[PDB]
Structures are given as structure tokens and as C-alpha cells.
């Protein structure tokens, strides 16, 4: 996250870290056994880390659970990043408390102008490299379809949205991928892509979760 603030320990209780010997992507806990992330985060041998704040120190609220199964969206296109969403089932159910909770799936799609919370352990610099050990947060508006498609001509599909600041300075970045965009207490987005970070007229691009709810429910019911 560039240009954000330090969330505070366990203030984003649904935030997951995906670990394969190291933190590589974020995710969201959507129930005691299921995590939603970005399909471009697909790896073998994922361990899901819950209850994290400092990812380099054991602070006492962690739950480390391996993935049993990973399901990439049937129509994921890695060249276009269209349908950039993945489901991860835990080997065991997480113990849900105030510090480790699930986030609700949306009933409706959020509109342009809605303020959302984006969080993760990604790079905090727009030029150069600096990775935080603690969770970073950013409040950002959902931009209009028009402004989005005009920033990224020919690249935005129905399954995407832009959020952030056309002025730049504040964005998601490398390492934030797969993490939540939560608006009015519901999971609306997944940190998907962008052209660099926090650059002028190049906002973050997010997977539009409201388009996938039916797929999510069906999959979870049968797996
Ligand atoms: Ca920790």
C-alpha cells in the first residue's frame, strides 16, 4: 500500500496472508473454511495465515492453516486478468473471534463514489522497494466506469473496477495482490492489477466480486 496508514493490530480481522515460505499475496476470509484471493496468486503449497499483524513476529493471535484445495475461476485469463479470482479451502476450520472474523459477500454491486478500505502488506513506495512488516490500510473511492476505461483504454471489462486517486500518490501495490476491498462492511473487490503504483492517471484495478457471488456460493456448497 502506498500513501496509506498503519491499520493497527487485528483491526482488519478478515485479512489473510498467503504464505509459501514467505508472504506472497493477501486474501479474505469469507467463512471458517474458505478464503477468496486473486487467481494470479495461484501457487501450490499455500499456507493461510490468519490473525496476522506483524508477519515477521509471532504476536499471539495467529492461526496457520494449510490449504486443502484451490479453485481458480473457470474463465480466468492470465493475459487480460479477466476473472481474476480464486477460492482456497482450509484443511481445518478457523477459530472465529473478534480478531479473526469472516467478511460478508455483497448482495449488490457498490457504485462509483463509495468509499472503501483496501489493506495489505505490499510495497509502500511508488519508486523503489520497501515492504512493511505490519498491515497497511487505505481509504479510497470507487471511480466511475468512464474514468476507469479512459485511464485504461481497451483493458477494462465488466468484471473490473477502478478505485483510488487519478492524482496518484495513494494506491495498492506489489504484494497487496489478492487482498480485500471492503465497502460498507461487504467484500466488493480483490486487489488485481494496475500500471505501476500510485502513478498519475493510473489507479488500481480490482476484481468486481459482486459478479461472482453465485459462483462462490455454488462452489462452496459442493466442495
Ligand atoms: Ca505475526
Amino acid at each position: 500500500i502506498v500513501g496509506g496508514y498503519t491499520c493497527g493490530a487485528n483491526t482488519v480481522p478478515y485479512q489473510v496472508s498467503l504464505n509459501s515460505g514467505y508472504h506472497f499475496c493477501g486474501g479474505s476470509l469469507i467463512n471458517s473454511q474458505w478464503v477468496v484471493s486473486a487467481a494470479h496468486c495461484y501457487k501450490s503449497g499455500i499456507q493461510v495465515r490468519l490473525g496476522e499483524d506483524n508477519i515477521n513476529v509471532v504476536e499471539g493471535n495467529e492461526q496457520f492453516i494449510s490449504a486443502s484445495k484451490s479453485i481458480v475461476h473457470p474463465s480466468y485469463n492470465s493475459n487480460t486478468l479477466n476473472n481474476d479470482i480464486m477460492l482456497i479451502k482450509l484443511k481445518s476450520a478457523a477459530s472465529l473471534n473478534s480478531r479473526v472474523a469472516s467478511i460478508s459477500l455483497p448482495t449488490s454491486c457498490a457504485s462509483a463514489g463509495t468509499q472503501c478500505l483496501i489493506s495489505g502488506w505490499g510495497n509502500t513506495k511508488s519508486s523503489g522497494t520497501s515492504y512493511p512488516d505490519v498491515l497497511k490500510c487505505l481509504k479510497a473511492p470507487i471511480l466511475s466506469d468512464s474514468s476507469c476505461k479512459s485511464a485504461y483504454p481497451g483493458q477494462i471489462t465488466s468484471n473490473m473496477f477502478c478505485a483510488g486517486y487519478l492524482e496518484g500518490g495513494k494506491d495498492s501495490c506489489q504484494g497487496d495482490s489478492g487482498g480485500p476491498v471492503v465497502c460498507s462492511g461487504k467484500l466488493q473487490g480483490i486487489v488485481s492489477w494496475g500500471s505501476g503504483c500510485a502513478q498519475k492517471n493510473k489507479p488500481g484495478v480490482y476484481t468486481k466480486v459482486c459478479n461472482y457471488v453465485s459462483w462462490i456460493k455454488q462452489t462452496i456448497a459442493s466442495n
Side-chain angles (χ1 to χ4, degrees):
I1 304 289
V2 184
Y5 60 100
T6 300
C7 299
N10 305 311
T11 62
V12 187
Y14 50 84
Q15 175 75 223
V16 152
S17 167
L18 301 186
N19 191 282
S20 63
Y22 53 89
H23 169 77
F24 69 93
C25 275
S28 299
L29 194 66
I30 63 173
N31 59 224
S32 71
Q33 262 197 123
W34 292 87
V35 164
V36 64
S37 196
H40 82 265
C41 288
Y42 171 80
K43 283 229 214 285
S44 178
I46 306 181
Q47 188 181 243
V48 178
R49 299 187 163 212
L50 308 178
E52 294 280 8
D53 187 48
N54 195 305
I55 60 175
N56 279 323
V57 355
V58 173
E59 302 184 284
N61 298 294
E62 299 90 350
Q63 299 177 54
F64 301 160
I65 312 173
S66 303
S68 171
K69 189 164 63 266
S70 182
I71 307 167
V72 169
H73 194 275
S75 298
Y76 174 58
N77 192 300
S78 63
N79 289 138
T80 67
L81 294 184
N82 190 203
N83 303 112
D84 188 24
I85 188 172
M86 178 180 54
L87 265 19
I88 300 171
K89 191 179 188 180
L90 303 174
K91 280 183 179 181
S92 300
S95 311
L96 299 178
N97 65 342
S98 60
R99 293 176 171 154
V100 176
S102 59
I103 191 64
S104 302
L105 253 22
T107 67
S108 61
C109 299
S111 301
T114 305
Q115 193 188 73
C116 307
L117 182 64
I118 306 167
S119 51
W121 288 279
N123 185 23
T124 64
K125 304 304 165 192
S126 70
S127 304
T129 304
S130 183
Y131 286 78
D133 294 328
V134 295
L135 228 204
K136 298 291 183 178
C137 278
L138 180 57
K139 294 179 183 184
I142 300 180
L143 300 177
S144 65
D145 171 269
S146 305
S147 65
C148 192
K149 294 189 184 299
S150 66
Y152 296 103
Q155 297 158 263
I156 309 296
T157 76
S158 70
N159 297 314
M160 303 174 184
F161 70 88
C162 296
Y165 302 93
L166 293 162
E167 184 167 304
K170 302 183 178 182
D171 205 355
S172 63
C173 206
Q174 305 126 213
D176 291 321
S177 291
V181 184
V182 170
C183 320
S184 310
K186 306 295 236 181
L187 184 66
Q188 297 286 177
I190 305 171
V191 183
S192 183
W193 62 278
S195 184
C197 308
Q199 257 58 274
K200 188 183 179 182
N201 286 280
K202 293 298 178 178
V205 191
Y206 298 93
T207 305
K208 202 171 194 180
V209 175
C210 64
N211 290 356
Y212 300 101
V213 172
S214 304
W215 173 71
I216 295 177
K217 302 195 310 296
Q218 167 62 49
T219 301
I220 271 52
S222 304
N223 286 286

